[PDB]
Amino acid sequence: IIGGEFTTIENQPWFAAIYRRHRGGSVTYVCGGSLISPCWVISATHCFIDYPKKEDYIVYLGRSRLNSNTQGEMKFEVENLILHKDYSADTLAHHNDIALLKIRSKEGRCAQPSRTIQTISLPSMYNDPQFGTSCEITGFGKENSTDYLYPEQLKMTVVKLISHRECQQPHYYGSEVTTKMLCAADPQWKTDSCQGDSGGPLVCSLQGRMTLTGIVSWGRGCALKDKPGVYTRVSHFLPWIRSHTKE
Numbered sequence: 001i002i003g004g005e006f007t008t009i010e011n012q013p014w015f016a017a018i019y020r021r022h023r024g025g026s027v028t029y030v031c032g033g034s035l036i037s038p039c040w041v042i043s044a045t046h047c048f049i050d051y052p053k054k055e056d057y058i059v060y061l062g063r064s065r066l067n068s069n070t071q072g073e074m075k076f077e078v079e080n081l082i083l084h085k086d087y088s089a090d091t092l093a094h095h096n097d098i099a100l101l102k103i104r105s106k107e108g109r110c111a112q113p114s115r116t117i118q119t120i121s122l123p124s125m126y127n128d129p130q131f132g133t134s135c136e137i138t139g140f141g142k143e144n145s146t147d148y149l150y151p152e153q154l155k156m157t158v159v160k161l162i163s164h165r166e167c168q169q170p171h172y173y174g175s176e177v178t179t180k181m182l183c184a185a186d187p188q189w190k191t192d193s194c195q196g197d198s199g200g201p202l203v204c205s206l207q208g209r210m211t212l213t214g215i216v217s218w219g220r221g222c223a224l225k226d227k228p229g230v231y232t233r234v235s236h237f238l239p240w241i242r243s244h245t246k247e
């Protein structure tokens with residue numbers, strides 16, 4: 001996250017921190033995710049597509065720091081890693097950038113809700129906030145494009161939804177951004193998602209409910225003029241989510 005503020009998990013309790021273990025035993029951060037029910041975290045396919053082996057992954061809930069422990073945090077492995085069969089990546093745009101991780105503790109349990117671990121509601125079909133709506137994003141992504149390391153402390157920021165019409169302007173993304181995606185940015189281009197924020201939530205308050213409106217997906221640079229953050233439009237994937245969150 002460029003700009004914005006440091007935060008802590010109690011303020012973003014649906015946020016899931018996703019890591020990958022390497023031969024040699026070192027663990028690196030991969031992407032954010034969001035707890036949509038106790039057994040299920042939702043994230044972005046591009047985070048996993050090159051290493052689609054569920055055993056490699058570690059998910060933390062209730063965690064506020066990258067490389068140290070948080071009181072009340074809970075560790076999970078991935079019981080099922082589900083990637084969207086139609087995922088693809090063009091030069092800029094990622095399509096069907098959505099994934100599901102079925103989580104389970106070493107004892108075989110799903111998440112236990114607490115003060116720092118809570119589900120976020122899914123949106124309903126084709127009911128997204130209007131353009132100009134302010135929403136929040138959270139993540140451990142870069143604070144500056146020139147950084148090579150991630151911040152140690154979770155960040156959040158607030159961005160405004162951009163219309164599909166504006167996002168498709170020539171100096172924005174033209175036809176590369178589709179109706180299955182949402183653009184959001186800061187009107188002064190001072191705050192944005194960035195590398196490492198992928199998979200994390202874009203949360204909008206809709207009819208008095210915190211809703212998972214988007215998932216961090218792609219963009220051109222970070223907080224660049226006329227280049228919004230692009231988000232998977234979760235409301236368009238309700239059938240896919242519903243079908244994969246079963247048996």
Ligand SMILES: CC(C)Oc1cccc(NC(=O)c2cc(Cl)c(OCCN)c(Cl)c2)c1
Pocket residue numbers: 030031046047048192193194195196197198216217218219220221222223228229230
């Ligand atoms: C996730 C990792 C294992 O591999 C990746 C594979 C393909 C694409 C990505 N994406 C990014 O690194 C990424 C970078 C930036 Cl700067 C970014 O911010 C754009 C919005 N300002 C985003 Cl959203 C993703 C990673």
